[PDB]
């Protein structure tokens, strides 16, 4: 779309936030997301961080989202938007780049931001930061109460 | 990617690491999956923290590339642990696996070969400061070449094409 928001952007961020809330309720890292087809707004998949729920070192919210979409032909990704409640780390950024997902809509980049946000732009992707306070407050609460668990999720 | 780019020194555990990575790739091939394997070794003592191979076909996974599967198999770890390890992979990493190495701060990546595949990740790793070593392992090259020959469409799916 460029500049103007996609008709499905609010739907996507609301779903990402719902996933983050669910993850928080399950005692995990409150980071969620979803992948939407820009063509019809269909939700290809949705998910949240599964580090605590599955003892996973790779299932960040974004990775879990992609995993939940299942095996897809490469072309499908080319016209989708990945929604994430928090700005992607270098790994999740790499996933978006590898699959060629053209747009990444981010809830906030205040609690966390890696060099990946800019790298996505360098690699030709459109990056949108909403600065969604609901996401920011939820993530901040987790960081406040379980700082070490947050650090573990990003190898800190 | 700069011009004054150099490879990296050799480690005493590199032979071991690539042998395990190759073993994982053969296992994956046996299981009917993508023959890409790896393992993570602690540079401090040579201990193998984990090993794995691509699980796209085995688990219907869109994210379990060989490198990702390897990290997953190590389980949850304190962030400091990754800081003195070497990630071994039979094939040069895509942008996602490169991102995983960068995020966790794994200081060294030893690659079997980059003849059958090479993404912008190999250079980006060096740009981000990581030590990269390409051993040009003929065992890995032959195995991957055969797979790409026999299953071109499946190879493309693994890299989203
Ligand atoms: Ca053929
Ligand atoms: Zn993240
Ligand atoms: Zn991530
Ligand atoms: Zn790969
Ligand atoms: Zn990869």
From Swiss-Prot, chain A:
- Biotech applications: Also catalyzes the conversion of 5-fluorocytosine (5FC) to 5-fluorouracil (5FU); this activity allows the formation of a cytotoxic chemotherapeutic agent from a non-cytotoxic precursor. yCD/5FC is one of the most widely used enzyme/prodrug combinations for gene-directed enzyme prodrug therapy (GDEPT) for the treatment of cancers. 5FU is an anticancer drug used to treat breast, colon, rectal, stomach, and pancreatic cancers, and is the drug of choice for treating colorectal carcinoma. However, the drug has high gastrointestinal and hematological toxicities.
GO (cellular component) term, any one: nucleus
* EC number assigned by the record: 3.5.4.1
Query: Which catalysed reactions does the entry list for this protein?
Result: cytosine + H2O + H(+) = uracil + NH4(+)
Among the Pfam families in the record, one is dCMP_cyt_deam_1
Question: Would the keyword Ubl conjugation be found if you checked this record's keyword annotation?
Answer: no
Requisite cofactors: Zn(2+)
Query: Active site located where?
Result: 62
- Binding-site positions, substrate: 49, 153
**Location(s), subcellular:** Cytoplasm; Nucleus
Domain CMP/dCMP-type deaminase: from-to ranges: 7-127
PROSITE patterns xref list: CYT_DCMP_DEAMINASES_1 (PS00903), CYT_DCMP_DEAMINASES_2 (PS51747)
Q: Name one GO biological process term.
A: pyrimidine-containing compound salvage
Which keywords belong to this entry? Answer: Cytoplasm, Hydrolase, Metal-binding, Nucleus, Zinc
Q: Where does Zn(2+) bind?
A: 60, 89, 92
Going by the record, the broad EC class of this enzyme is hydrolase
Q: Name one GO molecular function term.
A: zinc ion binding
Pathway(s) of this molecule: Pyrimidine metabolism; UMP biosynthesis via salvage pathway; uracil from cytosine: step 1/1
* Miscellaneous comment as given in the Swiss-Prot or TrEMBL entry: Present with 5180 molecules/cell in log phase SD medium.
What the protein does? Answer: Catalyzes the hydrolytic deamination of cytosine to uracil or 5-methylcytosine to thymine. Is involved in the pyrimidine salvage pathway, which allows the cell to utilize cytosine for pyrimidine nucleotide synthesis.
The family note in this entry says: Belongs to the cytidine and deoxycytidylate deaminase family.
Q: How does it assemble?
A: Homodimer.
**Mind telling me what this protein is named?**
Cytosine deaminase
Source organism of the structure:
Saccharomyces cerevisiae (strain ATCC 204508 / S288c) (Baker's yeast)
